[PDB]
Design a protein around this ligand. Structure first.
Ligand code: NA
Ligand code: NA
Ligand SMILES: [Zn+2]
Ligand SMILES: [Zn+2]
Ligand SMILES: [Zn+2]
Ligand SMILES: [Zn+2]
Lengths: 251, 245
């Protein structure tokens, strides 16, 4: 394959855990490589926020970690956007939306023929979506969920999706250039019961896996989330970024 | 007295940084959200908090009118767990879409409450009657009263003459206007500016608010088109538009 390294751009579209704060969005991350636009998760407010960066026609594929509302809320209106745009501005190609099949109802919802098509992913195999190669790790969370290791050439981006701490994250996240990790809890808070991680746990993974940059996301709605960075810095010495709308990372 | 804030107004899907159908009604401190589409929970918090919502009522289960119900359920759950227990939030909807109605319940945070389109519904200080619209899925327009004020919300529909008695003397008619005057609307279960203006005229409404807007052309032309037929006050929906009685 002839996909170039160091030519991937990741833009944070939404980053709030559970529900969005004012004027923003829950989980949604735009990955771009040589004109191919991959949307990772598609939560509440994501279609509105996405259009700060690209049009709905510009999306080439969507991939989903799990079917919680904060990760899929805008799939339906995305399907309507493709249908309406095709009718009024010119026919678009069928949009593939990649999801797991452990929630059959959730997976079925991804297809709105002929505008979008649900395509299953197999978490035990490596998926190719345009220039992106993706492998998966099953997380620990109240519904079936998969973390993703997204590569193009030699680039490595890991997205935790949602999880409580598991040691399997260490080998999975090994040497990642960017680790986009949920951090729903502060250091003083127990997170595992809820299927989430705290800043201590997240920082531990970043350190053990020797990641280059840690991006704290899926943020809580109490406190000052900047404190998560301060807490994580006590443990992990690499670069730490707090997710915000329009944060851009270049590989 | 009654107040209405446009939270979202785009038809089908939202434009950048905005939202699809969602209208916040307020009377005597009671906050009623009419429809709950995409981007609505994000936009709503420019005005009130999720805790502040007292009830929600839904015209139909198309994605552009219900997309944010799930994250609203999560907002109530999360807020109760972290900031203090909230009352159970009633979400009123029709029962003809069984799966859609069932979704509205997430105990103990929200509860689906059926409305009967043949009866008048009482939600706190608001009284709502319904008109079945013509649209690809089952849908109901709403005549919403509090005190001496009347607001009619078309929800989504192709033109039907039953709108005229239903909308009679409304202080505000919030009407979908998905098509320009030159465009066929009925076959899509929508209305054009000519049809909308025809209802406002025949019903003698006091203000007309054009909403559920299209994503082509210049929507200001809808106002110009409607004014050729309806001589009353005409407003094009935008984020944060406030109507007061
Ligand atoms: Na393109
Ligand atoms: Na209140
Ligand atoms: Zn989540
Ligand atoms: Zn989740
Ligand atoms: Zn609609
Ligand atoms: Zn509709």
């Amino acid at each position: 394959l002839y996909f170039q390294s160091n030519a991937m751009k990741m833009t944070v579209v939404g980053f709030w855990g559970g529900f969005p704060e004012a004027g923003e969005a829950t989980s949604g991350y735009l990955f771009e490589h040589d004109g191919f636009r991959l949307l990772v998760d598609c939560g509440s407010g994501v279609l509105a926020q996405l259009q700060k960066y690209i049009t709905p026609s510009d999306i080439d594929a969507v991939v989903l970690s799990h079917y919680h509302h904060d990760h899929v809320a805008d799939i339906g209106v995305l399907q309507y956007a493709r249908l309406i745009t095709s009718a009024t501005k010119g026919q678009l190609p069928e949009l593939p939306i990649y999801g797991h099949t452990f929630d059959e109802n959730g997976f079925h919802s991804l297809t709105h023929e002929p505008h979008t098509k649900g395509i299953p992913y197999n978490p035990e195999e490596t998926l190719q979506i345009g220039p992106f190669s993706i492998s998966f790790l099953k997380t620990v969370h109240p519904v079936t969920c998969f973390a993703m290791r997204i590569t193009a050439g030699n680039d490595i981006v890991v997205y935790s999706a949602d999880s409580s701490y598991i040691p399997e994250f260490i080998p999975f996240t090994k040497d990642a250039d960017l680790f986009i990790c949920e951090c729903n809890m502060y250091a003083h808070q127990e997170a595992a019961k809820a299927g989430h991680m705290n800043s201590t746990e997240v920082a531990s993974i970043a350190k053990d896996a020797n990641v280059k940059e840690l991006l704290l996301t899926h943020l809580p709605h109490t406190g000052n989330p900047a404190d998560l960075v301060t807490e994580a810095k006590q443990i992990f010495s690499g670069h730490i970024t707090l997710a915000h709308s329009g944060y851009v990372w270049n590989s």
